[PDB]
Amino acid sequence: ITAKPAKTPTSPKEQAIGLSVTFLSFLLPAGWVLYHLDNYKKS
Amino acid sequence: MFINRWLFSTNHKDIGTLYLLFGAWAGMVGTALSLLIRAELGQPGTLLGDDQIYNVVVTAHAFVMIFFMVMPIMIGGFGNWLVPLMIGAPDMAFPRMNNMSFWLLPPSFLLLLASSMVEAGAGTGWTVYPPLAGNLAHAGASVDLTIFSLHLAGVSSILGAINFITTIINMKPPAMSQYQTPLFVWSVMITAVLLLLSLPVLAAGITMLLTDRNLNTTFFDPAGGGDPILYQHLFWFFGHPEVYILILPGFGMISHIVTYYSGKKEPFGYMGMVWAMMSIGFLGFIVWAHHMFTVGMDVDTRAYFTSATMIIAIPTGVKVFSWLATLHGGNIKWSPAMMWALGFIFLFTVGGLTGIVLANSSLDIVLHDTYYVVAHFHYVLSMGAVFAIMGGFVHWFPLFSGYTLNDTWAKIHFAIMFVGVNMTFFPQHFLGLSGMPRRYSDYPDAYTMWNTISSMGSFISLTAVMLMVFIIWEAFASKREVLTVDLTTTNLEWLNGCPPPYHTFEEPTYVNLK
Amino acid sequence: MTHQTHAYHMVNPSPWPLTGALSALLMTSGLTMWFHFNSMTLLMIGLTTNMLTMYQWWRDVIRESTFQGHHTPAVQKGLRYGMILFIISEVLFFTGFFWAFYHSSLAPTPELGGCWPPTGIHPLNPLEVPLLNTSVLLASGVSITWAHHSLMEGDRKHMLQALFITITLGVYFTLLQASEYYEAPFTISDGVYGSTFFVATGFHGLHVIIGSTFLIVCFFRQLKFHFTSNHHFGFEAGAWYWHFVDVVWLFLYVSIYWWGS
Amino acid sequence: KIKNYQTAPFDSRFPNQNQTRNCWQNYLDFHRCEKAMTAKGGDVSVCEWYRRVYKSLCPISWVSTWDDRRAEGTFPGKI
Amino acid sequence: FENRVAEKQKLFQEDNGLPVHLKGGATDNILYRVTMTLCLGGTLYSLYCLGWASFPHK
Amino acid sequence: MAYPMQLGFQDATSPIMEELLHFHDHTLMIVFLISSLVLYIISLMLTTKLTHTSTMDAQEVETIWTILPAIILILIALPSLRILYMMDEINNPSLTVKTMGHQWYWSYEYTDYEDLSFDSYMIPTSELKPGELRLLEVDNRVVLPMEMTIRMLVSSEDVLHSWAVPSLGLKTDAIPGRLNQTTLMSSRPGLYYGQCSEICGSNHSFMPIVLELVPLKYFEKWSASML
Amino acid sequence: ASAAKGDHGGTGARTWRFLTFGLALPSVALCTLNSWLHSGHRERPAFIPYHHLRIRTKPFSWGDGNHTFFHNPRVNPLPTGYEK
Amino acid sequence: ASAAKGDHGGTGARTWRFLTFGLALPSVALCTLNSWLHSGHRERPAFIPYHHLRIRTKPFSWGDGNHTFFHNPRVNPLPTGYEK
Amino acid sequence: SHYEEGPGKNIPFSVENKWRLLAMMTLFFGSGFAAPFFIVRHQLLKK
Amino acid sequence: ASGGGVPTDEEQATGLEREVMLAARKGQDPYNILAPKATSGTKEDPNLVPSITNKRIVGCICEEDNSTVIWFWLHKGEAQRCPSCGTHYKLVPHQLAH
Numbered sequence A: 001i002t003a004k005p006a007k008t009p010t011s012p013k014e015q016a017i018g019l020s021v022t023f024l025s026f027l028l029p030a031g032w033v034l035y036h037l038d039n040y041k042k043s
Numbered sequence B: 001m002f003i004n005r006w007l008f009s010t011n012h013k014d015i016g017t018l019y020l021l022f023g024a025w026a027g028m029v030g031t032a033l034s035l036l037i038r039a040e041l042g043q044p045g046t047l048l049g050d051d052q053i054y055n056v057v058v059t060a061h062a063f064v065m066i067f068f069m070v071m072p073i074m075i076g077g078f079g080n081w082l083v084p085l086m087i088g089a090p091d092m093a094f095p096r097m098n099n100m101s102f103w104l105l106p107p108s109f110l111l112l113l114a115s116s117m118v119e120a121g122a123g124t125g126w127t128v129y130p131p132l133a134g135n136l137a138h139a140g141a142s143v144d145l146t147i148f149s150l151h152l153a154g155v156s157s158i159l160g161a162i163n164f165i166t167t168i169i170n171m172k173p174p175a176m177s178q179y180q181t182p183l184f185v186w187s188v189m190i191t192a193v194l195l196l197l198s199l200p201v202l203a204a205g206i207t208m209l210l211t212d213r214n215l216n217t218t219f220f221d222p223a224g225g226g227d228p229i230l231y232q233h234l235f236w237f238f239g240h241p242e243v244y245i246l247i248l249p250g251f252g253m254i255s256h257i258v259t260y261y262s263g264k265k266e267p268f269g270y271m272g273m274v275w276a277m278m279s280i281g282f283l284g285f286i287v288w289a290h291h292m293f294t295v296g297m298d299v300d301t302r303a304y305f306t307s308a309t310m311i312i313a314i315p316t317g318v319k320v321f322s323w324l325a326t327l328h329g330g331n332i333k334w335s336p337a338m339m340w341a342l343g344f345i346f347l348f349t350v351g352g353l354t355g356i357v358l359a360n361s362s363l364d365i366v367l368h369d370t371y372y373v374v375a376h377f378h379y380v381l382s383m384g385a386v387f388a389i390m391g392g393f394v395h396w397f398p399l400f401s402g403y404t405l406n407d408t409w410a411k412i413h414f415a416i417m418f419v420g421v422n423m424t425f426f427p428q429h430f431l432g433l434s435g436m437p438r439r440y441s442d443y444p445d446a447y448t449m450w451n452t453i454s455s456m457g458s459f460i461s462l463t464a465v466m467l468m469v470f471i472i473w474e475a476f477a478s479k480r481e482v483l484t485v486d487l488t489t490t491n492l493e494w495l496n497g498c499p500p501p502y503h504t505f506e507e508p509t510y511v512n513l514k
Numbered sequence C: 001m002t003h004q005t006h007a008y009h010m011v012n013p014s015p016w017p018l019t020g021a022l023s024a025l026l027m028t029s030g031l032t033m034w035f036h037f038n039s040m041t042l043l044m045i046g047l048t049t050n051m052l053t054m055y056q057w058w059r060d061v062i063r064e065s066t067f068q069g070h071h072t073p074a075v076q077k078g079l080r081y082g083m084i085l086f087i088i089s090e091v092l093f094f095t096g097f098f099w100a101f102y103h104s105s106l107a108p109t110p111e112l113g114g115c116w117p118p119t120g121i122h123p124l125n126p127l128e129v130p131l132l133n134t135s136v137l138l139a140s141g142v143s144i145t146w147a148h149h150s151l152m153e154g155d156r157k158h159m160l161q162a163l164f165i166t167i168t169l170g171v172y173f174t175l176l177q178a179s180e181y182y183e184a185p186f187t188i189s190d191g192v193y194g195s196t197f198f199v200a201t202g203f204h205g206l207h208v209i210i211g212s213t214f215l216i217v218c219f220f221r222q223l224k225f226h227f228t229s230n231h232h233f234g235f236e237a238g239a240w241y242w243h244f245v246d247v248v249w250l251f252l253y254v255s256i257y258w259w260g261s
Numbered sequence D: 001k002i003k004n005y006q007t008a009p010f011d012s013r014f015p016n017q018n019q020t021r022n023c024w025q026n027y028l029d030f031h032r033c034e035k036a037m038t039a040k041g042g043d044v045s046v047c048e049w050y051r052r053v054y055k056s057l058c059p060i061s062w063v064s065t066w067d068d069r070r071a072e073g074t075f076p077g078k079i
Numbered sequence E: 001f002e003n004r005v006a007e008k009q010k011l012f013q014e015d016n017g018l019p020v021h022l023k024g025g026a027t028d029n030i031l032y033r034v035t036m037t038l039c040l041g042g043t044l045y046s047l048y049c050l051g052w053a054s055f056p057h058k
Numbered sequence F: 001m002a003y004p005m006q007l008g009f010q011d012a013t014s015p016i017m018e019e020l021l022h023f024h025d026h027t028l029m030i031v032f033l034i035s036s037l038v039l040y041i042i043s044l045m046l047t048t049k050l051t052h053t054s055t056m057d058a059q060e061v062e063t064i065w066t067i068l069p070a071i072i073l074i075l076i077a078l079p080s081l082r083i084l085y086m087m088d089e090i091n092n093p094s095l096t097v098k099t100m101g102h103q104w105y106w107s108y109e110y111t112d113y114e115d116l117s118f119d120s121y122m123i124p125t126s127e128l129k130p131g132e133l134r135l136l137e138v139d140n141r142v143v144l145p146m147e148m149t150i151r152m153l154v155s156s157e158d159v160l161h162s163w164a165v166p167s168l169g170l171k172t173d174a175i176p177g178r179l180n181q182t183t184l185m186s187s188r189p190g191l192y193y194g195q196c197s198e199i200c201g202s203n204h205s206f207m208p209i210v211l212e213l214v215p216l217k218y219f220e221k222w223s224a225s226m227l
Numbered sequence G, H: 001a002s003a004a005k006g007d008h009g010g011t012g013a014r015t016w017r018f019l020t021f022g023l024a025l026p027s028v029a030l031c032t033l034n035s036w037l038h039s040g041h042r043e044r045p046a047f048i049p050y051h052h053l054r055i056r057t058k059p060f061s062w063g064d065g066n067h068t069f070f071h072n073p074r075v076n077p078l079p080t081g082y083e084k
Numbered sequence I: 001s002h003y004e005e006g007p008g009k010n011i012p013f014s015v016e017n018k019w020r021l022l023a024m025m026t027l028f029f030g031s032g033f034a035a036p037f038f039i040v041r042h043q044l045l046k047k
Numbered sequence J: 001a002s003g004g005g006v007p008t009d010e011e012q013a014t015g016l017e018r019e020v021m022l023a024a025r026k027g028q029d030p031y032n033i034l035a036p037k038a039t040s041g042t043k044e045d046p047n048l049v050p051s052i053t054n055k056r057i058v059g060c061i062c063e064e065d066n067s068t069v070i071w072f073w074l075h076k077g078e079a080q081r082c083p084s085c086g087t088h089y090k091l092v093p094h095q096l097a098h
């Protein structure tokens, strides 16, 4: 499979940010709930 | 107009895309649920607090991955996108009905999500067996919401099966016989037949569970002369076919991938390959009771079911060996997709062999309901179905989008996932042999090590899926359009460019009747 | 994007699938509201949107075929396979119920008296009304066949006449079955016997109504000349479905009414 | 004549894992023998065997409910 | 009756750029709008019920 | 019972469980063979520059790869069925014990002569005396005479449960309205643990089974002391 | 029994019309005559509170939740016995 | 059981050849394997002079008129009991 | 009909801005992954 | 008795149905419902592939019992050959003239 060059290339920095945003969107909401498991369990 | 195009579609491509989006989303829900499971088991003691929440989670995990991730992606997604393209058809036979098959899914999902929110949810296991699922042990709307989700999902797939079979049988070039359609197409036709015949029995079964809970019938209640075992028979009569329905489209994709990246015109033993899928499809309807070996059935019938279950290995063996024979002498391209396919071939073999161990009713007495079975099906599903889904995805992604993925990141992704899943499930074989039951939220201290390693493996896989989300972002963000594609002579789906126009085959292909 | 050179039908974007899907959501959750929070509003709304959807979807199918002529031979052949495949799944659906019946009656449990019919149950006599129903349905198997032939021979009056007889016969069966339901000395809550009996014949009863309205639709389409002596798939499907309903009854009769009592 | 009974022996009529009928049948048989021997002015000491067997095999709760049923005359089995 | 099928063929084959579900006239449109309204309204209604039931209401 | 970092089956306490260990060794040998063969072939195929991309004749080797697996399966099945029939084998038991699953505990009934009945609950981890196993201790063990053929009848009074004891090779579901029979026989005295093996609700993880095997003599006195 | 009415039980709209009015419909009249020269009234069955009948694990979602859908008072007793 | 092997169980000599060698014949081999991995020998049944068996109202018109046509000495007793 | 064709045009979401896409994708998969955790929370908060 | 009254296709079929109906009578197949018979496929007797545009995809089943169809775009111009068998195919205008 051959391709033209990226029309809007994503530099390493851009990637680093994209990767950071992604991971965060997965880890923050879950971390919040999990961190507070006790606050819910105790009722 | 977003509406006319995305909500009122009658285009096999757009519908296929809608399925891939839905399935991607559902997979996140399912993955989250799988992590809460391992979180609870990652350390002795209890984390969630009440074990009913655990059970609710274990249940939802199963339904989401099976009904909302694997099937929509494999059949609804890759099915709709590729089937017409591989046989030169303008669209499916019933494009309007096809759109309903899709739209029945969000409602169906909603009802499943609703069941875990009202009351205490449905902590019944994905088998939802009565009496536990009855109106006494599970009073409230939960189980009923779960049953309805299943009805909608069933209706969706039955309607889908009718479409695929009609399409594949009626809409090929007049000169092309069934023995000239690519294996993926065969794989989705056979799967459609299995769905058509098995789903209605399930529907009958859960309708009976529903009337028992709400109309005072006693199909499964001994009080009225019913029998809880009757449920098991109906559920599993659907249930075994279902597991083969989850892997057949995968067998199809793996055949195309292995062939392509080996630089061959066709897979080895094409007809042996067709024969094998039909056989698996057929035998898959007469082995159900191997899920009921500790239920108390006559010894003679238990001997029959173990004997029958074992012959399924013969046709499966010819497939595994044909894939290897296809690689033989090939000019191998080590692409991400090829990597996923090689992993599938091996992992699936491990999971399948493990299933042969379990086919023995004598030995299943002590393995039944232990983590040994959880290990088996996670090898064939999490490393079978899923690995095919990933290979198929990276391979055809350029055809669906017109853009290419960053091949290196894709390989990184594979490497991580390969470690995560094995670390997660391999240990579980030990747990089972040594006696740890399934559906337990805690365990005797002796089983600590393996459960600990296992829960750790599960986080590795988490990293891999986050990573994957990024990989898709970068491809769309970078925008490297496709120029030329290899081997189009034996791979029709690519002939219309990437992505193919809204309407393909407006003028049919030309195939001589030599 | 040129002039198409294949005989298939590309259907105009349609809202009906979305609407039908939403209907399904309304009915199921409406049934959930009815069973648990004793309300029928949702279920009612659901039922309504469902009829509206079926009406409009099938209206369009007629427009697309009879009025726009999109049903080329290739398209019809597809429709035949779809109908057949549909009937097949209906057969499997009913198979679950026959399984349940045979499972219960062949191995009656101690709590039933260890015998079939359970002690305390007074089954209907198969030589009375059940025999009648049997003759009514088979008779309509015959009249619908005459209808079909009248149609292929271009006889409009007889096709309408035969179709009419078939319909009144199906209606007659519904009324008889309804009366029996009322007269029956056992109910759905009478254990596995009443369970098995009422959901199996109840569903069949529901299919007889679906088949009748399907035929009623064919009746009106004929009054308005929609059918030609060679192109009348709506009718053929109506007929196949009717025979399916006929056959399922024969199995209920022999299994549940005769053998099972 | 046995009272040197250890436990219900193997019964070829009920040779498989499911013994539901074994309990049931012996429970029935006993009450039927008991009734005959009491109804024809005779000895119930013949009916003993069945009571030992059904007693060994039937769960307590089943035996209790069946007895209660017979008392109220709603016992489904024909005794 | 009388055969007016040919007349309806013309109405529906008329190149008015209307999709078949509206090509029939002004009534198709009201039905359509009635249907869509009930579906969406009812869907909102059900979501609400789901909410109420989600919390212990007793 | 299971010890930390265990890999295989718990040691066999009965003869059928011994039989199974050996049958499993046999089967595992074969799965190792097949799985290693497949991996070697895969690695063989991917390690050469030689190519042969033209077509190859299908049929010829397909027979080896159909007949061979058929033979291997017969080699697993024969033994499997032999043992399968042994487990159900016409045994002449000297005692019958019933067990009834309940939502969250097992109750036992020895009624051959007396009307001995008792419940058996898991001992909470906070009431465990030092040296006791966390989620495995039950307050009232099920005492049985070692070296004898006991007949167990399993049933349930509510939902489904499954009475299992790995060490002895037993697992029989407990189903409401049904009496399932299994044959117990221990060749050693001792304590043997098991756990509910069918999801039965919230406390499905906390309703163990502990068997205590002692000589007949001690079984009898125990019977009498339990009423 | 068996069957054999000479020939022509196939091919021709006239033939199927012939069968419709000469065999099918007459059968219906006979079965109707029978089903009415027999169908009178079964004396309502003696009520005995069997536990495997009149099941109620959850109240019906209509009426008073204790009456089946096509409840017929003359022949269908409630769990407590006949109504009136 | 049931059945469903994907599609193509109709139309094309190639298809019926396919079914002949891929389904029909293999079934025969399996039933042959079974019928031989089971069929050994039933111990000859104990002879008891029941009157409703070994009927002789008229001697067979062949041999000594007391032996059935496919008489098998190992398993078929004469009215007086087994032969040898 | 006159629907647009080509790379980035056969999809229900705009791919014209990589950062807006980053956001939509984040919300999309994010909400998906998040749901189970909040349900578990919701259940823990009724009792 | 008899009567008539039900329309025939010849009189009521409309749209594409009628088009294929009529076209079928003259022995023509504008809607590719039938399979095309092959010629000798030489340079002088190439398979004539009708097209309503300037290129049509051709699938060549090189030999009777082949499972793989060889696919390729045939263009307006000179005869092209199947990449696998060399059979010749030449584009020609379809009956609806572009």
Ligand code: HEA
Binding pocket: B243, B244, B246, B247, B290, B291, B309, B310, B312, B313, B316, B317, B318, B320, B348, B349, B350, B351, B352, B353, B355, B356, B358, B359, B360, B364, B367, B368, B369, B373, B376, B377, B380, B381, B384, B385, F034, F038, F068, F069, F070, F072, F073
């Ligand atoms: C992708 C889905 C999938 C697939 C394909 C399979 C395939 C197989 N499975 Fe499994 N299985 C499941 C998913 C699947 N399964 C699920 C979800 C459950 C648990 C459900 C639940 O209870 O929740 C389950 C459980 C399950 C049980 C129940 C055990 C118990 O509950 O106690 C059994 C019993 O026999 C079984 C066996 C088999 C067999 C024999 C195969 C065979 O198809 C495998 C054949 C493959 C091979 C054999 C390897 C390749 C062959 C060769 C290289 C040739 C040489 C081989 C030999 C000669 C041996 N599976």
Ligand code: HEA
Binding pocket: B020, B023, B024, B027, B028, B031, B034, B035, B037, B038, B058, B059, B061, B062, B065, B066, B070, B073, B124, B125, B126, B127, B374, B378, B381, B382, B385, B386, B389, B390, B393, B421, B424, B437, B438, B439, B440, B441, B458, B461, B462, B465
């Ligand atoms: C398809 C089936 C499937 C899949 C993929 C998985 C995935 C996972 N499952 Fe599975 N699970 C089941 C189906 C599945 N499960 C079933 C049926 C049961 C039994 C339930 C019951 O007993 O009732 C079960 C139960 C079960 C248990 C037993 C619970 C118990 O007995 O108490 C455990 C425990 O570890 C477990 C863990 C895991 C984990 C860690 C994952 C991890 O692998 C998750 C990691 C993520 C992935 C591996 C997939 C990512 C893929 C995508 C995100 C799609 C990408 C999209 C596109 C490219 C379009 N699952």
Ligand SMILES: [Cu+2]
Binding pocket: B239, B240, B243, B287, B288, B290, B291
């Ligand atoms: Cu199975």
Ligand SMILES: [Cu+2]
Binding pocket: F101, F102, F104, F160, F161, F162, F196, F197, F198, F199, F200, F204, F207
């Ligand atoms: Cu339990």
Ligand SMILES: [Cu+2]
Binding pocket: F161, F162, F196, F197, F198, F199, F200, F201, F203, F204, F205
């Ligand atoms: Cu349990």
Ligand SMILES: [Mg+2]
Binding pocket: B368, B369, F162, F197, F198
């Ligand atoms: Mg189980």
Ligand code: NA
Binding pocket: B040, B041, B042, B043, B044, B045, B046, B047, B441, B442, B443
């Ligand atoms: Na835990």
Ligand SMILES: [Zn+2]
Binding pocket: J060, J061, J062, J070, J082, J083, J084, J085, J086, J087
């Ligand atoms: Zn060629």
